[PDB]
A paper describes a structure:
Accordingly, we solved the co-crystal structure of [name] loaded with a non-hydrolysable GTP analog ([name]) bound to MP-9903, a peptide containing MP-6483's same macrocyclic sequence but with only one arginine at the N- and C-termini. Due to the opposite chirality at residue 5, the N-terminus has a more solvent exposed trajectory. Consequently, the hydrogen bond between the backbone carbonyl oxygen (O) of Arg4 and side chain nitrogen of [name]/Arg102Nη is disrupted and Arg102 hydrogen bonds to the backbone carbonyl oxygen (O) of d-Cys5 due to the amide bond flip. All the other interactions observed between [name] and KRpep-2d were also observed in the crystal structure of the [name] – MP-9903 complex (except the interactions that involve the terminal arginine). The extension of the linker between d/l-Cys5 and Cys15 by a methylene (thioacetal) group increases the Cα–Cα distance by 0.65 Å and remains solvent exposed. Specifically, RBD binds at the PPI interface between the switch I and switch II regions, whereas MP-9903 binds at the allosteric pocket between Switch II/helix H2 and helix H3. Upon binding of RBD, H2 moves towards H3, however binding of MP-9903 moves the switch II and helix H2 towards the PPI interface.
The RAS GTPase serves as a molecular switch to activate signaling cascades related to cell survival and proliferation, most notably, the MAPK and AKT pathways. Human malignancies gain growth advantages by mutating RAS at positions G12, G13, or Q61 to bias the protein to the signaling-active GTP-loaded state. In particular, Sakamoto et al. used phage display to identify a disulfide cyclized peptide with the sequence Ac-Arg1-Arg2-Arg3-Arg4-Cys5-Pro6-Leu7-Tyr8-Ile9-Ser10-Tyr11-Asp12-Pro13-Val14-Cys15-Arg16-Arg17-Arg18-Arg19-NH2.10 This molecule, termed KRpep-2d, bound KRASG12D with nanomolar affinity in both the GDP and GTP analog loaded states.
Author numbering:
A (entry chain A): 0 to 167
B (entry chain E): 1 to 13
Amino acid sequence: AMTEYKLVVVGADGVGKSALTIQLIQNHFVDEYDPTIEDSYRKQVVIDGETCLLDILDTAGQEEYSAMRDQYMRTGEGFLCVFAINNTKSFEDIHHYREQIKRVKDSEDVPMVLVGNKCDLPSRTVDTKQAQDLARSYGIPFIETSAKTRQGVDDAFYTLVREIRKHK
Amino acid sequence: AXPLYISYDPVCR
Ligand SMILES: Nc1nc2c(ncn2[C@@H]2O[C@H](COP(=O)(O)OP(=O)(O)CP(=O)(O)O)[C@@H](O)[C@H]2O)c(=O)[nH]1
Ligand SMILES: [Mg+2]
């Protein structure tokens, strides 16, 4: 009975939710052949010596009804809250995603990691001082990633699993 | 906005 961790990836349209997940699951950067519909994926990985299974919901179609999203938001054990470092509006949306997760989990204590994706781009508009101050106000880790180069991707998911391990 | 549509979230209702 290998430990299973249920993870959910949330964030504004276009921040790279699918790109982060597809690098971990399929070892490539998202292209026109990868599907765009919301789905869950499974992956066996070794994190700090523990062989475990990750079950990841990649959210999409945010305005439409989804029975899977309804189930997995309630059972999710940890959430990656993603913004893009070149899109201030996506960073401004983070607090709304976090407030919704707390509302649906009916708890003030939910494992989460703040992810600033697209860190390969020169056009940064969200400074790390602003993002780190937000993560510190929530008591959660902050990591910057590039799903394109894969920088930080595996570490973002492993960091979230480390936060889930502290919940219990 | 939600931001996600979740059927049992009171804000979505
Ligand atoms: N430069 C760069 N572009 C990225 C990165 N990650 C994703 N992108 C680009 O951003 C766009 C959206 O990526 P995608 O992974 O589909 O984002 P998403 O958040 O799942 C989109 P949706 O909310 O509609 O499902 C694509 O054009 C993709 O190539 C990154 O790390 N760097
Ligand atoms: Mg997507």
